Design an enzyme around this catalytic site. Structure first.
Site, mmCIF file in Angstrom:
data_model
loop_
_atom_site.group_PDB
_atom_site.id
_atom_site.type_symbol
_atom_site.label_atom_id
_atom_site.label_comp_id
_atom_site.label_asym_id
_atom_site.label_seq_id
_atom_site.Cartn_x
_atom_site.Cartn_y
_atom_site.Cartn_z
ATOM 1 N N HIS A 87 0.814 -1.122 0.110
ATOM 2 C CA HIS A 87 -0.002 0.055 0.037
ATOM 3 C C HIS A 87 0.798 1.409 -0.136
ATOM 4 O O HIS A 87 1.886 1.124 0.626
ATOM 5 C CB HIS A 87 -0.908 0.058 1.140
ATOM 6 C CG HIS A 87 -1.948 1.056 1.102
ATOM 7 N ND1 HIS A 87 -1.863 2.240 1.604
ATOM 8 C CD2 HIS A 87 -3.303 0.931 0.682
ATOM 9 C CE1 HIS A 87 -2.813 2.933 1.534
ATOM 10 N NE2 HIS A 87 -3.744 2.226 0.769
ATOM 11 N N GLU A 155 -3.114 1.472 -7.532
ATOM 12 C CA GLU A 155 -3.376 2.654 -6.785
ATOM 13 C C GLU A 155 -2.835 3.917 -7.529
ATOM 14 O O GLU A 155 -1.622 4.248 -7.771
ATOM 15 C CB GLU A 155 -2.507 2.544 -5.685
ATOM 16 C CG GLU A 155 -3.195 1.389 -4.651
ATOM 17 C CD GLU A 155 -2.597 1.634 -3.212
ATOM 18 O OE1 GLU A 155 -3.233 1.754 -2.334
ATOM 19 O OE2 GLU A 155 -1.292 1.561 -3.039
ATOM 20 N N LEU A 217 -10.407 -1.551 -3.510
ATOM 21 C CA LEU A 217 -9.815 -1.109 -2.143
ATOM 22 C C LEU A 217 -10.328 0.045 -1.691
ATOM 23 O O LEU A 217 -9.497 0.787 -2.366
ATOM 24 C CB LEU A 217 -8.238 -1.665 -2.122
ATOM 25 C CG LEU A 217 -7.754 -1.395 -0.690
ATOM 26 C CD1 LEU A 217 -8.346 -2.510 0.288
ATOM 27 C CD2 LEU A 217 -6.089 -1.789 -1.047
ATOM 28 N N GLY A 219 -10.629 3.361 0.967
ATOM 29 C CA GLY A 219 -10.441 3.839 2.098
ATOM 30 C C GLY A 219 -11.421 4.588 2.959
ATOM 31 O O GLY A 219 -12.152 3.974 3.503
ATOM 32 N N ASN A 220 -11.266 5.903 2.930
ATOM 33 C CA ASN A 220 -12.294 6.632 3.864
ATOM 34 C C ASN A 220 -13.597 6.446 3.743
ATOM 35 O O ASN A 220 -14.382 6.447 4.670
ATOM 36 C CB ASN A 220 -11.870 8.185 3.685
ATOM 37 C CG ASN A 220 -10.402 8.504 4.166
ATOM 38 O OD1 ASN A 220 -10.007 7.929 4.998
ATOM 39 N ND2 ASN A 220 -9.808 9.464 3.748
#
Ligand code: NA
Ligand code: NA
Lengths: 235, 244
Positions: A87, A155, A217, A219-220
């Protein structure tokens, strides 16, 4: 192939916030033979989270040691199913492509499933995107023993810029061709490639519709109730 | 000063081996009002470990983030929410394999003390540094990196890790250790005052085993140990016993 949506809580949460959030996740009726849903809590929250979430959800940890570190052997012993490797936060703790290869080798020798992250910076996007991504992927791809059990994540590190669903699809495409080149066409067709840029309830349908995007994937947006709607885009 | 004995499990354990080990530890009769004994298990073993251990044992985690809430990290805030009493900061393994700096140590200690955690703060010089007569230089710089942060001098515990006698062939003796601890203690005297220097615990963080513990703990400025692999054993009870 099975779509896969993952909640990366990163360094967030309290014992109460987890109870409520796992409860709302639990409310979702989805079929786990159809759709993998994986929650990655902070290490010291793992047992609490794993208890509270129903068996339809899988769980994992956000990092693993290539050797304060959680070893792959320890994860194996605890029945921890997934680990996140590479990551961009970890890379930007100075983790290198070599550390990523070596973590993957450790996890796979222990029967862990790995969600492996990579992607190119703003400057590299000097038209170096396929080059950067080919090097990042070639650094570990030869280690993959079962292509259901390694999940790639793109990403887009490249800031005030936004990636379009078209720009995501184009990089996914090329990752699956890097895999096809390096490992075979059946392997490439088997492997899940998730989008790991900014995902929310508003853009998730446009991305999951893309032929080479097999999930996310997150996140927030995965710290909220409405993460169930990101999951629903994949149902 | 209460003596202080810490068990650093490092990257070790299974669930049954921890049940067995915690059972052996629980069998030791000591008075926790007279002696601090702290267990630092791997993060994912913390809950299990804390449940199995009797309240006479304190517990902690092996590292904490310098960043608050916001991949891979455990924040001081999360630790405080979990009532995790201690953290270890600056262990040589973090300085070696994670590039942790003296600045990271300061900021971690800052984040820890702001969240009411107690901190076991490690430092120590290499073989090459010791060979160039840089022991005092390096320890002074390392301690001065964080020492002005300390409020209650019961709640920060210093650990001298003789890196020069860790995997080098070289062995350190108790006289050598004592000399360093005395120097550490004067650094604290010189920076925070006489009362604070005599309050603070300074542990030895080199190789501690059933063989050597008593030779170590008896030195005047050695107040305990941060013990690695010898704490993965039932005979860790005998190391505690030297500090009793
Ligand atoms: Na798709
Ligand atoms: Na002593």
């Amino acid at each position: 192939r099975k779509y896969f949506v993952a909640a990366n809580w990163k360094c967030n949460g309290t014992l109460e916030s987890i109870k409520s959030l796992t409860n709302s996740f639990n409310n979702l009726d989805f079929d786990p033979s159809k759709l993998d849903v994986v929650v990655f809590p902070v290490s010291v929250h793992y047992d609490h989270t794993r208890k509270l979430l129903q068996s339809k959800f899988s769980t994992g940890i956000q990092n693993v040691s290539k050797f304060g570190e959680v070893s792959a052997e320890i994860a194996k012993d605890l029945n921890i199913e997934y680990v996140i490797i590479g990551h961009f936060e970890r890379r930007k703790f100075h983790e290198t492509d070599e550390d990523v290869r070596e973590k993957l080798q450790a996890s796979l020798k222990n029967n862990l499933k790995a969600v492996v992250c990579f992607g190119e910076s703003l400057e590299q996007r000097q038209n170096k995107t396929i080059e950067v991504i080919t090097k990042q992927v070639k650094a570990f791809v030869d280690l993959i023993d079962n292509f259901d059990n390694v999940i790639l994540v793109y990403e887009p590190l490249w800031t005030g810029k936004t990636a379009t669903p078209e720009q995501a699809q184009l990089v996914h495409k090329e990752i699956r061709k890097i895999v096809k080149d390096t490992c075979g066409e059946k392997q490439a067709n088997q492997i899940r490639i998730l989008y790991g840029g900014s995902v929310n309830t508003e853009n998730c349908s446009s991305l999951i519709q893309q032929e080479d995007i097999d999930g996310f994937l997150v996140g927030n947006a995965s710290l909220k109730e409405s993460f169930v709607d990101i999951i629903k885009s994949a149902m």
